[PDB]
Amino acid sequence: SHWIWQHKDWPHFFWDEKLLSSHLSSARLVQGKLLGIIHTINQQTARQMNAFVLADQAVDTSAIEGEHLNRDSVRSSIANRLGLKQKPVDRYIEGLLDMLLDATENYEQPLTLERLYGWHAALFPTGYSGIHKITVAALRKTDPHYEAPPSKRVNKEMRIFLNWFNKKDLDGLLRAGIAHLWFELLHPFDDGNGRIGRAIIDLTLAQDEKQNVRYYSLSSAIMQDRKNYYTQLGKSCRGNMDITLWLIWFINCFKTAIHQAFELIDDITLKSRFWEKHATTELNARQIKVLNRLLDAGKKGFIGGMTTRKYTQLTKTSRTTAYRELHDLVLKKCLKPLTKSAAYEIRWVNKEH
Amino acid sequence: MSHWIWQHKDWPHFFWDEKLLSSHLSSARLVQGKLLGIIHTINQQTARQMNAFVLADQAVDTSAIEGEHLNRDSVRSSIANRLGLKQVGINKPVDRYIEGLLDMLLDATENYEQPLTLERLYGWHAALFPTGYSGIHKITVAALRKTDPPGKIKVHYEAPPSKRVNKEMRIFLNWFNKKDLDGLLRAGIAHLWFELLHPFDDGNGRIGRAIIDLTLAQDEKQNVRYYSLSSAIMQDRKNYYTQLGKSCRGNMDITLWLIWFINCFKTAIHQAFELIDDITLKSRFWEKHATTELNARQIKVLNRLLDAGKKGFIGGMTTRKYTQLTKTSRTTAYRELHDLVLKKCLKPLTKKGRSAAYEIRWVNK
């Protein structure tokens, strides 16, 4: 009677509907805002956004498990996939990307055992997880601090989970949060349950939005909040069927993901508006190099601002030239001074210019 | 059927089914956010065009709910002067009612950080009744009624006696200024509660819908209305009064009213989606045709057709319509319409040339 899946009412999850109401409506409000932004920006800006988020998705869902991808390989593969400008094929990165893209692009298709087996084969080409040989593309046949249900139960538990999942008879955000917790508690594979469960979240949200591109990443939010994530899973797996606290945690993670996406799209459009306004500005290569470095840090900027010393670390020019070129950038309204050595920050081009 | 709702022993403690309303609120927030995200992302000029159009709908429709039928051109002319837009028609003497009505609507959405007070309501009421009369009847203006409560819909409802109105309003305003509940619920409750009190001799509907505007502006922190619940209420006028249920509402359970109110909000948002889509189609058209050579007549006609949006003119643009808008001969119209097809501005709205008509060749993303 220690684990949730031993509970007499398993797997009939329930929650405090009156309490969740204001969390869900506030989540829908920011989700709608992001969707309204994406609908209005042009296709070039959306494709750049898509490229950034997909690289974060791959990197962060891997980092959650302690696996650190070559980001250059990730970016290069995404650029080829999306048709953007710009090595050996990295089988693990391609398989991870193929799983993530199947989950958001084929959202009209049901989640089936065969489809999960394909995701699992995409993550484990060699049949090994580190040193350990595992079962690939099939449910575990043995035991995976948490004890998951015994393996003789796993095939039925998964049939119930999937019959429930494909009904879509609940608010889409709740289905995402329930599906993630339920899948994790079953741990149906020998390994890869974390990445596949987060791909299930992606599938659920793509079905909810009817949107075949993820413009935000829950993995990036989970990774940012990883300590609470593990604490909350640990509490839930020892709890009863009232998963109110898990769902509040999950909706807050969703909101964090949307807010990170607001910041990204705001940074992308701030930069392009800046360069529309200043392509008429005469600048030499060094000034253009330094402005791009600072613009890519976005609204948050450099901690101390741009300084003469940082300018000479990036350009390798003399202090006198950096000092004068920085004043030149102030005069041309590209930079503006900060407040107690001199420091500068981007002068943003806000609204129409 | 035995007692008015304001005689109920639990008045004014409205309640509703939180579980049933949850999915309506979540759905409403989603489309509200979508509109707000669009508004945040379009440029300033586009947002201002949207503002001017919604504000004319707000003025015309909140008046039409009461059987007061405004000249839309006058409203547009007054809005264009206030928002610094290109002049609409020759500047004629002002209609004090239109300017007061606009003053009220703009105060409700722009000064959203200020509380609602009796003094503020009196100012709105003075703006609506500048002559001191409601038609033939002299009425109490800029003060609560001292007696008992056209195309206006009559409802046989009895509001509280005037000796109680000031106390009832103080209770209502103390609740209103707490801002202690979900903004959409607050807008729905505020409007129902105000309507049931009928605090003024006349003007209660228009002031009650301005209170909705104030509430939504406070919810959104947005000093411009980009959608209009009056325009939605106008499409369902009869159900509006029915759903208010003034006669036979009876209990303090307002679940059905709040669900209706949330549906009207969503209708208003869905209408704004269509409007902003039409506005952006036009600006996108003029971006592509900024280099297209056109004379002033062709530009006048295209602007008139583009202002009809995707739906277009009934029957499309015709030769005769071209000559009614330009005062040109038929042969000049044949050449200029042909020229506009050649330059990809217009396209044949029919496949048959016996009768010929044209529509805008839209420029998609």
Residue numbers in the entry:
A (entry chain B): 4 to 89, 94 to 151, 165 to 360, 364 to 376
B (entry chain A): 3 to 151, 159 to 374
Share the article's original sentences.
Here, we identify the protein product of CBU_0822, in the following referred to as Coxiella burnetii Fic enzyme 2 (CbFic2), as a DNA-binding protein and AMP-transferase that AMPylates Histone H3 at S10 and S28. According to sequence analysis using SMART including outlier homologs and PFAM domains, it encompasses a conserved Fic domain (115–223 aa, Fic motif HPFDDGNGRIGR 205–216 aa) with N-terminal inhibitory helix (TSAIEG, 62–67 aa), an N-terminal domain of unknown function (DUF4172 domain, 4–85 aa) and a C-terminal helix-turn-helix (HTH) domain (304–362 aa) of the DeoR family.
In the asymmetric unit of the crystal, CbFic2 is present as a symmetrical homodimer which, according to the program PISA52, is the only probable assembly and is predicted to be stable. Within the dimer, the interface is composed of amino acids 20–43 aa in helix α1 within the N-terminal DUF4172 domain. According to an analysis by PDBsum53, residues S22 and S26 interact across the interface. The crystal structure reveals the predicted HTH domain to be a 2-stranded winged HTH domain where the tri-helical HTH motif is followed by a β-hairpin wing. PDBeFold55 analysis of the HTH domain of crystallized CbFic2 revealed structural similarity (Q-score >0.48) albeit low sequence similarity (%seq < 18%) to Z-DNA-binding (ZDB) proteins, which belong to the same subclass of wHTH domains as proteins of the DeoR family. A structural superimposition of CbFic2’s HTH domain with the B-DNA-binding human transcription factor E2F4 and the Z-DNA-binding domain hZαADAR1 of human double-stranded RNA-specific adenosine deaminase ADAR1 reveals that this tyrosine is not present at the conserved position in CbFic2, but moved by one helix turn toward the N-terminus (Y341), similar to the tyrosine in E2F4 but with a different rotation. However, AlphaFold prediction of CbFic2 results in five models, which show flexibility in the orientation of the HTH domain in relation to the Fic and DUF domain, communicated by a kink in the long connecting helix between the HTH and Fic domains.
